[PDB]
Design a binder for these strands. Structure first.
Ligand SMILES: [Mn+2]
Ligand SMILES: [Mn+2]
Lengths: 261, 261
DNA sequence: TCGCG
DNA sequence: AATTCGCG
DNA sequence: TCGCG
DNA sequence: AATTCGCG
């Protein structure tokens, strides 16, 4: 849209970049916009880093590790800035998940199910895995006021509108987006506390209850509601939106070099 | 141990109760100890309940639901008390997870792996599912100061000490508890912020950072380190320990009926 | 190799 | 990765 | 039946 | 449920 990020976007659409390769393009574009700031991209972050990050908040936290070389590699990597104190502040982390062959299966006439008679396939629950990494990066950033975690969904198990796929013998299949036989979207809505789905939830909500005030860290959860695949341009533009917001909340610690380099 | 909870314990060991049936025995024993209080046990709690619970903290929270009849059934159920305001306060919620056939496979001479040559089986990552329900019940209790979630682990993928299993041709297998080829324990340590494993982490830690003070909700994560199965008595005694702590933190709202009934 | 996915 | 199916 | 596991 | 295996 805004000028130069339109060229980058068309570039992503032109090659159908996976989320990893788009995440690097966000590093690219960001560095064209903020040439005073220093961005790094990495494909891993490891439990020692998280642990020490935790310990720096409380001396009783982050004291565990069973497999020494333990890491987590979000399939979208991690983008970072260096702040005015040389520390590195994570601007983005993204992951991509698939679930629900149903549209392809219907499209090709292949009937599924134990006895080969099922038009649809009883939705499984693997997508609950997505919660661990979210817990990790949310712990990693337990001292930040922003949580730039974007999870990208697609597949028949994540429909947000009602679609009818037509199997080879001319027959259509009414696919009811709100069926528990299909839709697994609710398996994720714990991550952003039941706030909007396709939405920038990067800046943390500071809710309260008693004297007990608390901070909330909400993963931004995006979907391709029509069951189709993601436009590499749109994926990029979202990721750019999240990361700029991430920088906006970090602006206290990015003033000096942005105004003196 | 303490008198009557020893009889209940021997009862659980005598029939090798699954965690569900033990969770009901905790309701049993608790009601023998607190006959003024009113305990309920249920096998489900549903997303509408969670959502409304969320909304009662912030009018922007808990506004999502795709499959109407959406529930979550922790395999250990939910135990509750009625407080002085007729409201129900969850005293316990427990789940049981398995991973790692390796000990049984070695024990029976069955070599695994794509080409039938592997003594061990490359550990998979399904146990990351455990994080969703934890996020759910942690959201459900976002207004409490206690989080009585107990997760029970067992299997070769959750060893905490070093064990050697002996395959039928007299051969032993050194099983290295800290191998990433085996141990998946680190896949869970995000849930209790890297605090102790076999430990009552029910009372919430109130850590801080800036002016921003925050509350933490740590699942209590127990293991059978030697790869063996759980003693139904020990499972029960832990669950009892957690729930009594849960009551201790609830004692403001349990005074009147405990002293007037 | 280890370990994440 | 992310699936297939079982249980109510 | 729907939906969780 | 919770698995098998692929990728570095
Ligand atoms: Mn992925
Ligand atoms: Mn279970």
């Amino acid at each position: 849209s805004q000028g130069v990020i339109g060229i980058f976007g068309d570039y992503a659409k032109a090659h159908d970049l996976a989320v990893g390769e788009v995440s690097k393009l966000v590093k690219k574009a960001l560095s064209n916009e903020y040439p005073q700031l220093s961005f790094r991209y990495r494909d891993s972050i490891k439990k020692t880093e998280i642990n020490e990050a935790l310990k720096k908040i409380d001396p009783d936290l982050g004291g565990t590790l069973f497999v020494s070389n333990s890491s987590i590699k979000p399939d979208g990597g991690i983008v970072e800035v260096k702040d005015d104190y040389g520390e590195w502040r994570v601007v983005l982390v993204a992951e991509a998940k698939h679930q629900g062959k149903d549209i392809i299966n219907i499209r090709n006439g292949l009937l599924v199910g134990k006895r080969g008679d099922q038009d649809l396939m009883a939705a499984g629950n693997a997508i609950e895995r997505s919660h661990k990494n979210i817990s990790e990066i949310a712990n990693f950033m337990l001292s930040e006021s922003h949580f730039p975690y974007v999870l990208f969904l697609e597949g028949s198990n994540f429909l947000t509108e009602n679609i009818s796929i037509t199997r080879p013998d001319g027959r259509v299949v009414n696919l009811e987006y709100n069926s528990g036989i299909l839709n697994r979207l609710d398996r994720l809505t714990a991550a952003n506390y039941g706030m909007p789905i396709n939405s920038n939830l990067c800046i943390n909500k500071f809710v309260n209850h008693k004297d007990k005030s608390i901070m909330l860290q909400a993963a931004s959860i995006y979907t391709q509601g029509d069951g189709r695949e993601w436009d590499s341009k749109i994926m990029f533009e979202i990721m750019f939106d999240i990361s700029t917001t991430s920088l906006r909340v970090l602006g206290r610690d990015l003033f000096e070099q942005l105004t003196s380099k």
